[PDB]
Amino acid sequence: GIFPVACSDGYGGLVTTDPKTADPVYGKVFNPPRNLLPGRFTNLLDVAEACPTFLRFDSDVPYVTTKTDSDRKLVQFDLSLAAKHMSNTFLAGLAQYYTQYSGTINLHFMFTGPTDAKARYMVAYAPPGMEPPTTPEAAAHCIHAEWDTGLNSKFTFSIPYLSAADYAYTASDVAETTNVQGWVCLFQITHGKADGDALVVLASAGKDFDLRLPVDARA
Amino acid sequence: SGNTGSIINNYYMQQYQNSMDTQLGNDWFSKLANTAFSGLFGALLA
Amino acid sequence: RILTTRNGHTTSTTQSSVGVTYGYATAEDFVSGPNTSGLETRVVQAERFFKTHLFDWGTNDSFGRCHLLELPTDHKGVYGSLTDSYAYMRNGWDVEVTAVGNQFNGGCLLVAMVPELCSITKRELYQLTLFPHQFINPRTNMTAHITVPYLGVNRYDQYKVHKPWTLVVTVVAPLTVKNEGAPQIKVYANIAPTNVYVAGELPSK
Amino acid sequence: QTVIQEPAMSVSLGGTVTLTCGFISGSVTGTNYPSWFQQTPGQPPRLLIYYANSRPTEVPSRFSGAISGNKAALTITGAQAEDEADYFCCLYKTNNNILFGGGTHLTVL
Amino acid sequence: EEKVVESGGGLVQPGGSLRLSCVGSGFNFKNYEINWVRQAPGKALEWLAYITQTSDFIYYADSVKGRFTISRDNSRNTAYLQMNNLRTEDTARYFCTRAGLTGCKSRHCMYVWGPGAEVVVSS
Amino acid sequence: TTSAGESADPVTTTVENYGGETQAQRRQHTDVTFILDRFVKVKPQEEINVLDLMQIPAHTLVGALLRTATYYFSDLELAVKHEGDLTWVPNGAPEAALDNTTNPTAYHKEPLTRLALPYTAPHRVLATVYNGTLPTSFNYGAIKATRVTELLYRMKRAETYCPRPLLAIQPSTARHKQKIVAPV
């Protein structure tokens, strides 16, 4: 009369990250109300979009400094989320726990010089396949944006997702000497009396930024 | 509800399986992200 | 960009405002919880501005120079009287940090409202923008205005043994004076409690 | 060193005197944050002027600070008998280099 | 009354080490920056060391960089100046100064001064 | 796109600024409830283990992502390897109660013991940081056995508030290099 079952082999072992739920032992517990608590966030990428975070540059500062030299390259950093320049951003903190990403990454440049310190900057994205540009003249052939400093002190540029595959690795491999996602180059086209002024750079996620394949590889 | 992956209703009642939530008397950062300013500010540059 | 704020019978007008940053909420949640048994009362006499001196920003201050202020600080007024005469209290904050220098100065300050903060490292400062914040940039503004609600583990708390909020001012870019800038900028704070509720009146000293 | 002060100055009682503080090569500006201290023998120095023009509440109104002629200046007007002491000049020049003057000995006749 | 007192001085053979202790009373030691200066007998003041509120920024004069070490303990309301490899040039009266005043929240204030501790380095 | 920058108003731009097209987003793997719903190993004490979610090491995925929230709420799940009988006690109860088997006691199963414990704290939410060392009431209770060898936590119905900084490994080189899995 008993309904017969077959205890299959290889099934039923404890797997972490498995969709099943455990059996209760303690019922009829009511929690204190949590209705309309401030600060609720349900998706970490919503926080990544809403809150830009500073990049890191030489000598641990969140800004680049105006250069008067012939070399107008302010900074040149790999597009990887494992880059040293992005190692202090919320976006990299998320990306370290995921295997793959895909989407636009937004950079925000805020000018903090005096009101009489006008400057003109260019930001360019160099895709993989060639040495990164050393001069703004060569970088003018890439996807780039130029901007002045004026009443509006912040300018936002969207680094696009350009890859052969649909998703790109968040972590870099030891054998890959050159970055597989290219480089972001920030130049200074010109400046007025803006010697020693700071351009503060922040990073955030774009509309189509996605992280996938969670992984725990220490931190 | 994450990591559910089951189409069969739970054997135990929700009263025992989970602690019940009480109401009194929302997603803030989704609201921030959705109301973010996009597009150009003034005229067109290039 | 003229903005005038009015708390109680106190007013504060600024002509270089970049708007008000509401943090974590635009309104207040429920104040009549089951933990007070309906004995809470509102004290509108305490919703006033009080002035404190944060620090003095100079060319000496490099990046990472961080100053903290736990908001339920020493208040010589109605608010401090409530703290000393009531067991449980609840309020949000309306903070106006002013760094009045000159439009010929450079650099940048970040003013943030961090819940449950006692100390912060330099690396974490890079993500200080995760909190309700504004930038004070002398080329464009000299006042940061942030409004935050009550926010804690409990609906009411004992402010003698817990400080829910911390006002944080950090130097993002060093101050530059050059020739026509102000030699130093005295950073002050003008803070107003909002929606003050008290419960459990204490005996006299 | 590199900070020049007058080695000694004399002022009549109730008179006006100006102690001066310069660099050997350069101009003293507000970015140097000049400070003026007063010291009597066997006593720690006490602050008279900070930020080159500001004085504490307890310091009398006789002492005034200014930046004139590319040099920091401490003016004592209506000097009393208590103003005879060594006056020192603190100047800021980079984070790890805080300079002090030689010290001017002011005597009241 | 806001005051600071220095202790730990005396006569020490050159090449030795000793630690000055600064104890402050009448104020919240956590909220103020600490300077260590010294004055040679008959000479002018010389600034030696500077430490911030949470010991995050520390600066030394080039003459005593590496030789000296400044630290603080806010729970004990104390500051410490450990001097190593002392030379005969270091014989002076050492002052612990609290940088801070009503309307002066920077390091260029140097308002509160202690009586100073004498250090005599000779052989 | 130019804006004020001083305000915290989000300014997110897209590639259509220079002729591109924004693609679809698939963000189910960064959902708070989904990502925190997985077992994480914690260091077990010999006999008595107070169930505090801060016992999760900060370098693990679950620990780090939990520490990104100032306040959190969740039900708890345990996977425990133990000898003898495992007794669980809600918070606010004396440790002596861990010797009484009328409290929820799991008899030795064979490989492990999986339990679903509710949120028993007297607070509406628990905090990862407290500006009062957290208060002793920030716990899910305690468990006791003859010897606990393996202990795993799993947050259920996790809710998070007030995001906090989340730091990655800071490399000394141009970028952080790792030995990524690849066929040999």
Side-chain angles (χ1 to χ4, degrees):
Chain A
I2 301 300
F3 169 96
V5 299
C7 286
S8 315
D9 265 19
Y11 294 76
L14 171 71
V15 182
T16 66
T17 76
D18 77 311
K20 288 142 55 183
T21 61
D23 280 357
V25 298
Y26 212 62
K28 297 188 181 181
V29 176
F30 290 84
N31 308 318
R34 302 186 312 281
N35 194 1
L36 316 181
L37 282 186
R40 173 76 180 276
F41 67 102
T42 58
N43 196 350
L44 298 161
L45 276 190
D46 272 343
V47 181
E49 290 183 353
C51 301
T53 50
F54 302 111
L55 295 195
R56 179 199 174 282
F57 300 96
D58 271 28
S59 304
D60 296 303
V61 294
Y63 55 84
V64 293
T65 292
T66 295
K67 294 184 183 181
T68 65
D69 283 22
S70 290
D71 189 0
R72 291 180 287 171
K73 183 184 288 292
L74 283 176
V75 66
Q76 185 269 331
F77 63 95
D78 302 297
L79 191 49
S80 66
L81 294 156
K84 184 175 175 66
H85 292 83
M86 293 181 71
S87 79
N88 281 335
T89 62
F90 187 70
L91 198 60
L94 291 176
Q96 81 185 318
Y97 295 117
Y98 292 89
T99 299
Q100 290 162 28
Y101 83 94
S102 68
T104 304
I105 292 171
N106 286 329
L107 295 183
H108 319 262
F109 309 88
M110 209 197 324
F111 190 62
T112 62
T115 189
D116 70 296
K118 296 181 184 293
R120 174 62 174 267
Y121 298 101
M122 181 213 307
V123 62
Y125 164 66
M130 188 179 288
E131 187 179 4
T134 63
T135 65
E137 294 179 354
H141 310 295
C142 305
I143 292 169
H144 73 276
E146 279 196 29
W147 77 96
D148 273 350
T149 65
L151 186 77
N152 290 340
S153 59
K154 191 167 91 193
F155 171 77
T156 308
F157 173 68
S158 286
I159 303 165
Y161 180 77
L162 281 180
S163 184
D166 291 331
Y167 299 88
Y169 291 151
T170 63
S172 50
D173 177 68
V174 294
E176 297 167 338
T177 61
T178 58
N179 188 38
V180 300
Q181 286 301 108
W183 309 266
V184 185
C185 302
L186 172 71
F187 300 90
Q188 194 179 236
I189 295 310
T190 190
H191 67 282
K193 200 182 74 172
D195 295 332
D197 282 335
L199 185 71
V200 175
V201 193
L202 305 95
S204 73
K207 289 290 187 183
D208 48 336
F209 191 85
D210 292 329
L211 288 168
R212 79 194 286 248
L213 303 181
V215 62
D216 192 4
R218 298 201 38 91
Chain B
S1 66
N3 283 62
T4 60
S6 188
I7 64 170
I8 301 298
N9 290 333
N10 197 40
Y11 180 66
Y12 301 93
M13 293 183 286
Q14 293 298 308
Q15 184 165 54
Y16 290 80
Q17 175 62 60
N18 281 111
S19 61
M20 279 296 112
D21 289 346
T22 61
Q23 300 291 101
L24 185 62
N26 196 0
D27 213 324
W28 172 251
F29 279 78
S30 178
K31 180 177 177 177
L32 272 181
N34 291 339
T35 62
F37 178 42
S38 44
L40 267 64
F41 185 78
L44 164 77
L45 189 149
Chain C
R1 308 190 301 264
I2 295 92
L3 180 70
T4 295
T5 184
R6 189 268 302 277
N7 279 291
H9 302 294
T10 54
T11 56
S12 182
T13 300
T14 174
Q15 296 177 334
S16 89
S17 67
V18 293
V20 182
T21 297
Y22 292 83
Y24 295 143
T26 57
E28 199 71 26
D29 51 0
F30 316 96
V31 304
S32 293
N35 68 314
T36 50
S37 299
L39 299 176
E40 70 275 13
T41 60
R42 172 156 177 179
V43 190
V44 300
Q45 286 83 44
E47 298 178 289
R48 297 182 69 251
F49 271 123
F50 58 98
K51 295 182 183 293
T52 185
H53 185 194
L54 292 182
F55 67 106
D56 282 11
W57 181 28
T59 64
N60 173 275
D61 291 330
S62 66
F63 164 72
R65 194 67 179 90
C66 189
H67 294 271
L68 270 61
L69 173 74
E70 300 165 353
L71 291 177
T73 179
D74 192 11
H75 188 274
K76 308 301 191 194
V78 175
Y79 192 74
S81 293
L82 308 170
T83 300
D84 288 331
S85 61
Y86 278 103
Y88 309 109
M89 189 182 292
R90 189 189 197 277
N91 63 342
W93 300 100
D94 191 26
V95 181
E96 179 180 1
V97 170
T98 58
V100 178
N102 197 358
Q103 68 269 15
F104 297 106
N105 279 92
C108 189
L109 293 178
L110 176 59
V111 179
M113 295 297 292
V114 190
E116 316 273 13
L117 187 73
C118 201
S119 43
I120 187 159
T121 63
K122 285 177 183 175
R123 288 193 65 207
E124 278 164 326
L125 286 171
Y126 286 81
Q127 301 181 33
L128 195 62
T129 48
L130 288 175
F131 304 106
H133 72 276
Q134 280 205 350
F135 288 97
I136 297 179
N137 195 359
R139 83 191 313 274
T140 176
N141 66 346
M142 54 175 178
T143 294
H145 195 178
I146 311 164
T147 304
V148 294
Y150 175 77
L151 184 141
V153 169
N154 313 301
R155 199 157 302 98
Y156 287 70
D157 59 355
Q158 299 177 357
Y159 280 148
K160 295 286 208 43
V161 297
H162 184 244
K163 308 308 201 252
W165 284 98
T166 303
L167 175 67
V168 179
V169 191
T170 195
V171 177
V172 179
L175 179 71
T176 68
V177 179
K178 282 178 203 196
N179 286 320
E180 294 294 328
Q184 69 280 315
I185 301 186
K186 292 198 155 93
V187 185
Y188 287 88
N190 195 2
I191 308 158
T194 66
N195 312 106
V196 181
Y197 287 85
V198 293
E201 65 272 15
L202 299 171
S204 66
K205 291 174 70 175
Chain D
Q1 292 182 330
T2 73
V3 177
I4 297 172
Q5 291 192 222
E6 197 67 50
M9 293 179 71
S10 298
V11 59
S12 67
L13 183 67
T16 305
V17 64
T18 295
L19 281 71
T20 300
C21 182
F23 285 129
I24 290 177
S25 177
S27 299
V28 161
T29 74
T31 306
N32 294 117
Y33 311 108
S35 298
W36 287 94
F37 302 91
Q38 185 191 64
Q39 183 177 43
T40 64
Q43 189 180 55
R46 75 146 172 161
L47 174 71
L48 290 185
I49 296 294
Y50 63 97
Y51 294 153
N53 49 21
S54 297
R55 61 179 175 86
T57 304
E58 72 172 76
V59 167
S61 314
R62 300 195 304 279
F63 305 94
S64 177
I67 291 172
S68 180
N70 295 356
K71 300 172 80 71
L74 170 66
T75 298
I76 302 101
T77 301
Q80 297 298 109
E82 299 178 0
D83 291 341
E84 172 168 307
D86 294 347
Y87 295 86
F88 297 89
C89 182
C90 182
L91 297 172
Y92 169 84
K93 189 171 181 179
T94 72
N95 277 289
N96 60 5
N97 182 19
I98 302 297
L99 294 174
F100 273 91
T104 295
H105 183 68
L106 182 69
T107 175
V108 182
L109 310 178
Chain E
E1 183 183 28
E2 295 177 353
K3 61 183 289 273
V4 293
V5 292
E6 302 95 347
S7 76
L11 166 69
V12 164
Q13 189 178 11
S17 298
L18 66 91
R19 186 179 68 188
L20 269 298
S21 296
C22 194
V23 186
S25 296
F27 59 90
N28 199 338
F29 200 83
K30 186 178 179 181
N31 294 343
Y32 287 106
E33 293 149 82
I34 295 298
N35 289 284
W36 275 97
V37 301
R38 72 178 177 199
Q39 166 147 41
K43 301 293 185 181
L45 295 158
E46 178 185 5
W47 169 84
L48 301 157
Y50 159 77
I51 190 166
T52 60
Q53 282 105 354
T54 55
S55 297
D56 58 356
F57 295 89
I58 293 175
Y59 297 111
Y60 309 86
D62 284 345
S63 66
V64 298
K65 188 188 225 313
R67 294 175 64 249
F68 290 13
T69 303
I70 186 175
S71 48
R72 63 194 285 153
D73 195 326
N74 293 337
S75 43
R76 281 88 170 95
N77 297 295
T78 52
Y80 303 95
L81 180 66
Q82 177 79 67
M83 297 186 288
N84 308 316
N85 297 115
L86 282 164
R87 298 175 290 169
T88 59
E89 295 177 359
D90 289 17
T91 292
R93 196 172 190 98
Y94 286 67
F95 299 92
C96 182
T97 286
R98 199 213 65 181
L101 159 71
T102 312
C104 203
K105 294 234 165 184
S106 66
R107 63 181 292 165
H108 327 283
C109 309
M110 300 220 281
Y111 184 43
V112 178
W113 294 64
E118 297 179 358
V119 172
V120 183
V121 177
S122 68
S123 176
Chain F
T1 294
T2 59
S3 56
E6 316 312 313
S7 43
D9 291 331
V11 181
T12 191
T13 57
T14 62
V15 289
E16 292 83 3
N17 289 344
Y18 45 85
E21 183 179 1
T22 300
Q23 305 301 137
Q25 64 181 357
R26 260 167 270 272
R27 292 180 178 178
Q28 292 180 357
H29 279 174
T30 51
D31 180 30
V32 163
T33 303
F34 170 82
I35 195 57
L36 291 179
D37 198 351
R38 63 203 61 240
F39 279 113
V40 57
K41 185 184 286 185
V42 307
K43 175 69 164 193
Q45 320 279 309
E46 293 82 3
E47 294 181 357
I48 296 170
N49 297 266
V50 177
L51 302 176
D52 191 359
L53 282 185
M54 302 320 300
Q55 297 295 322
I56 309 167
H59 70 266
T60 60
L61 181 144
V62 175
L65 291 179
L66 169 59
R67 269 164 190 88
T68 61
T70 308
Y71 312 98
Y72 63 92
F73 164 86
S74 67
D75 288 316
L76 188 63
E77 276 200 2
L78 299 187
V80 180
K81 290 183 180 180
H82 58 94
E83 306 170 352
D85 298 345
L86 176 77
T87 298
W88 174 83
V89 166
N91 62 0
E95 312 216 323
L98 285 166
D99 299 308
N100 298 2
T101 55
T102 308
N103 311 113
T105 295
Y107 278 62
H108 187 273
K109 179 67 173 66
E110 189 276 331
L112 73 164
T113 284
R114 286 203 57 188
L115 301 172
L117 308 170
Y119 175 91
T120 57
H123 314 289
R124 59 194 183 175
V125 290
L126 295 187
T128 64
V129 285
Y130 200 76
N131 202 11
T133 304
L134 297 185
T136 62
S137 66
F138 292 1
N139 51 357
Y140 285 77
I143 60 169
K144 185 177 179 180
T146 296
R147 179 166 92 268
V148 175
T149 58
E150 208 170 279
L151 175 58
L152 292 94
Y153 289 7
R154 176 166 184 167
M155 320 165 76
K156 306 293 296 186
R157 315 199 291 120
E159 302 176 4
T160 46
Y161 308 83
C162 304
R164 301 198 78 83
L166 175 57
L167 299 181
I169 293 281
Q170 184 178 2
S172 66
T173 48
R175 67 188 187 276
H176 187 51
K177 298 290 181 67
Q178 300 197 252
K179 191 266 183 181
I180 297 175
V181 294
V184 191

